[PDB]
């Protein structure tokens, strides 16, 4: 009976952003060389969908730069990204929320845990 | 023009049709046979979800050498498919029928798919190049679709045939037995 109350709390808490590290090497093991880069984007989309339950994910062209920077066969083993959930203002929309993912630039992605970004 | 039922009065129902539609006849027939006698809102939700690939329409007559799926077990069949293009065409007629029902003033809360029909259509001509300089036909099978929506009452709990039954032509010996039993019992 408190599911609606939790969504109400979420009405205040819907805007949020976190930092995630996606281990793409463990998910691209064995796939065809001529399909690694196109498959990685779909895996990022499914990772964001599973992470935020939004069913509507929007990619950053800078993240496209970071994933296509070394050709199709060259994909980084690990990557660090920012996931932020924001509201959809267009009235003719199935579901009222969506996610917008973008690339956080760092020298290396090792040793860093997941954190909630606060402004 | 002239519908296939003709036992349904136009003033208490709604109807619609469309002809020369370029959709597969065998797939559209299975969709139509799937949605027959259902509630209008349930049919619209089910058919649109078919486009969303959450449930499948059972293939029963035109199902020769077709793959199997687990979503058809609820119909008790192992073969089912997802005819998106026919479902899209069906939405147009179901919405048109709803627009005619509201315009006519019927109560839109409780409708039933009373009648639904799919018919074949004249074919279209195309050619193919096979081998050794031969040419073979390349046809299409369009169709016509029509349906009628009526009200739902489903309330019958009385009949008089048993009371009506009576004994007119009786033999004399049996009538005598009936009278004797009437006296000895009352």
């Amino acid at each position: 009976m408190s599911s609606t109350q939790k969504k109400q709390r979420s009405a205040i808490a819907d805007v949020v952003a976190r930092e995630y590290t996606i281990h793409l090497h463990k998910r691209l093991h064995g796939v065809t060389f001529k399909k690694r880069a196109p498959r990685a984007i779909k895996e990022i989309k499914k990772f964001a969908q599973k992470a935020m339950g939004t069913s509507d994910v929007r990619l950053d062209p800078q993240l496209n730069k970071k994933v296509w920077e070394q050709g199709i066969k060259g994909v980084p083993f690990r990557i660090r990204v920012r996931i932020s959930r924001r509201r959809n203002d267009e009235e003719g929309a199935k579901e009222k929320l969506y996610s917008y993912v973008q690339a956080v630039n760092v020298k290396n992605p090792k040793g860093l845990l997941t954190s909630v970004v606060e402004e | 023009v002239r519908y296939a039922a003709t036992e349904i009065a136009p003033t208490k129902s709604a109807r619609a049709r469309g002809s020369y539609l370029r959709v597969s006849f065998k797939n559209t027939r299975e969709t139509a046979q799937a949605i027959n006698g259902w509630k209008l809102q349930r049919a619209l939700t089910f058919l649109q979800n078919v486009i969303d690939k959450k449930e499948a329409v059972p293939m029963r007559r035109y199902a020769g050498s077709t793959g199997r799926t687990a979503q058809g077990k609820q119909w008790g069949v192992s073969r089912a498919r997802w005819p998106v293009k026919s479902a899209q065409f069906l939405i147009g007629l179901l919405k048109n029928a709803e627009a005619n029902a509201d315009a006519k003033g019927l109560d839109t809360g409780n409708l039933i798919i009373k009648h639904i029909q799919v018919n074949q259509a004249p074919k279209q001509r195309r050619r193919t190049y096979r081998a050794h300089g031969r040419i073979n036909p390349y046809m299409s099978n369009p169709c016509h679709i029509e349906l009628i929506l009526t009200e739902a009452e489903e309330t019958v709990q009385k009949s008089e045939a048993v009371v009506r039954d009576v004994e007119s032509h009786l033999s004399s010996r049996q009538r005598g037995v009936r009278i004797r039993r009437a006296l000895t019992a009352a």
């Binding site: 205040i12 203002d89 267009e90 009235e91 | -």
Partner: protein, 50 residues
């Protein structure tokens, strides 16, 4: 007096796209105010720390 239904629909096209974009912009402004109020309001800041 319009040359039947077709003409009204032809103009309605332009009318519809204009109204939809305008409506979206109005929703944008309304939410932008809601957000300004949320940011300014101090009750939430004390509530989260507790």
């Amino acid at each position: 007096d319009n040359e039947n239904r077709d003409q009204k629909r032809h103009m309605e096209r332009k009318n519809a796209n204009a109204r939809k974009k305008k409506k979206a912009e109005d929703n944008a402004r309304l939410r932008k105010l809601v957000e300004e109020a949320q940011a300014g309001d101090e009750r939430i800041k004390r509530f989260r720390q507790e």
